[PDB]
């Protein structure tokens with residue numbers, strides 16, 4: 001819907017979500033943003049919320065996180081898919097089954113693709129670096 | 136050390152928040168153990184059946200009092216939140232305590248290797264006795280960060296998979312360092328969380344979930360998720376995993392001793408208070424609990440109706456608010472002009488939102504027909520339970536300035552009003568139990584320039600005295616100066632309400648209360 | 654119920670220029686600034702001041718009970 005959108009480059013999405021959720025918050029957060037944005041996202045959480053973090057910058061720098069979020073029932077997660085390649089294959093087969101079930105059901109859709117030939121790998125890297133790509 | 140308002144749910148006046156679990160007969164005579172958000176220390180607890188288990192015939196009611204809180208929180212923390220599976224490794228702080236013991240019982244059933252922290256050596260011996268599966272290498276010290284080295288060395292530097300933490304400050308940081316990849320942290324202590332102590336996010340590079348376990352939420356919300364924990368506890372009870380803790384029983388009259396014993400911190404297991412003894416019969420279907428003496432404080436039935444004359448006045452609104460907090464759910468307030476200020480409108484709207492059936496009447500108690508109409512309105516809301524006459528009209532001035540009209544004006548709402556109220560109540564109010572009229576020290580001690588006010592106030596007292604002598608209720612409270620809303624300093628509102636609570640339960644007819652200057 | 658005192662504030666912004674702009678003189682000589690409190694967004698805004706994330710904790714009464 002038209003009310004399902006906010007701005008990612010500014011921290012104004014907190015007011016959008018809090019207003020449109022009735023002031024409660026959001027149950028699930030899938031965040032990949034920087035420090036100030038990451039802090040703003042936490043304040044969007046609701047009781048029994050779950051913060052799924054897939055970024056690295058704040059984790060790498062060991063930035064502080066206030067523990068008052070916990071008093072609201074909350075579940076902060078650290079989601080790194082790279083762990084599967086190193087160990088925990090039995091845990092990986094569950095994700096594999098989920099992906100296959102999605103493929104056969106129809107939930108999984110391929111994304112829009114921009115194709116660069118093998119001889120033009122440098123151009124592909126530059127295009128991705130620019131940041132204007134969708135998909 | 137803890138503010139009563141911290142407990143979730145809008146409890147009123149911060150009264151009776153003590154107690155969370157009990158174990159006793161059901162209304163039908165069945166032994167049951169329960170879990171109440173508050174007000175568990177009492178001779179009767181009102182609860183929903185969802186929060187009630189059954190006490191198996193093997194158990195004694197004494198043992199049952201130890202199970203609910205600790206085992207429910209342990210199950211919710213481990214199985215539901217930490218998703219424990221067989222074979223994992225756990226570091227369970229404060230093993231001697233109830234939650235630690237329940238967590239050990241749950242873990243050892245699944246076969247996990249359990250690390251526990253105990254403050255002393257007697258607790259170590261006790262735990263070694265209760266759970267033989269624990270080895271000598273599974274015990275650390277909870278009064279220092281030495282447990283971190285223990286866990287790290289004996290786990291080969293890998294760490295632990297779960298951490299049911301209750302410690303604080305530097306201990307909490309040490310607990311996190313024990314976590315292994317994919318390990319989960321279960322925070323049940325509420326000190327650092329209240330203080331917003333920082334937590335470095337670098338621990339999350341290792342796949343880790345930092346849970347905050349607060350069971351107080353279930354008692355007041357998240358009813359659907361409760362059935363999971365209820366089923367888990369029931370399954371444990373029937374399978375035998377749940378084993379009651381050792382209880383130190385204190386009698387009812389010695390509750391202060393129980394609190395002191397808990398405070399000293401030397402207890403191992405659970406401290407319970409024996410309100411009543413257990414009878415041999417399986418289903419006693421008893422009528423009532425044995426009576427006991429308790430301080431008398433005022434409460435009102437939900438189905439009765441009360442009339443506060445002059446209820447929109449400064450004291451009337453506070454008196455109504457006090458009445459609402461004591462269980463009044465239908466009120467009638469009287470005023471010649473009606474709601475005409477913001478404060479009155481705010482209070483009435485809040486009361487209506489809370490569910491109180493407030494109603495503002497213009498009926499004037501000065502005229503007998505008006506009094507009958509007022510009582511009829513109260514009846515429409517329900518049986519009349521109490522009548523409070525707080526109306527006042529003031530015309531001060533020395534006798535040389537006074538005049539008959541001023542005397543009539545001052546006396547009408549207090550003298551005539553009380554006469555009409557007495558008549559109509561004696562006529563058509565059989566369920567009435569309170570009838571209070573507010574007087575002033577000017578009546579008793581005297582004050583210049585208030586002759587008519589004193590005459591009116593003294594006249595109310597006579598009606599109340601007659602009412603009591605004939606068996607009907609009556610009480611006149613001679614107040615001094617009300618502050619928030621002679622030689623006597625003004626009296627705050629809270630003190631006035633406490634005194635009024637005392638006065639309502641005395642056997643006398645006229646009472647007074649005032650604060651002496653200097 | 655009971656008195657709550659501030660314990661934490663997440664962010665406070667002050668802008669004296671906007672503050673002077675927002676003040677409007679009343680029909681009397683006194684000046685005034687309108688204030689809006691939005692509990693949903695946890696923001697208090699008045700003039701050139703903007704408070705967010707105010708946390709208040711109940712402070713136990715002094716129980717001096719100077720009135721007996």
Ligand SMILES: NC(=O)C1=CN([C@@H]2O[C@H](COP(=O)(O)OP(=O)(O)OC[C@H]3O[C@@H](n4cnc5c(N)ncnc54)[C@H](OP(=O)(O)O)[C@@H]3O)[C@@H](O)[C@H]2O)C=CC1
Nearest residue numbers: 208229231232233234252253254277301323348349350400
């Ligand atoms: N999140 C939630 O809703 C819940 C939180 N909790 C918390 O986890 C803990 C376990 O609960 P509970 O069963 O009531 O714990 P207990 O009060 O039974 O045990 C507390 C532990 O603290 C240590 N201790 C020793 N002496 C004292 C003392 N004088 N004062 C304080 N602590 C002392 C002991 O561990 P040691 O032997 O190592 O010294 C003892 O086992 C509590 O701190 C509780 O608040 C648990 C249940 C519910």
Ligand SMILES: NC(=O)C1=CN([C@@H]2O[C@H](COP(=O)(O)OP(=O)(O)OC[C@H]3O[C@@H](n4cnc5c(N)ncnc54)[C@H](OP(=O)(O)O)[C@@H]3O)[C@@H](O)[C@H]2O)C=CC1
Nearest residue numbers: 445447448449450471472525526527548573574575614617
């Ligand atoms: N507060 C004090 O300092 C003390 C007061 N008292 C008594 O204790 C009570 C405290 O109330 P208080 O704060 O003084 O109240 P107020 O003096 O502020 O107002 C009295 C109330 O009665 C109403 N009232 C006034 N005249 C009439 C009338 N003719 N018929 C019906 N209702 C009327 C008023 O509303 P409206 O005017 O619109 O009708 C108002 O709701 C009163 O009974 C007072 O006389 C005595 C000792 C101490």
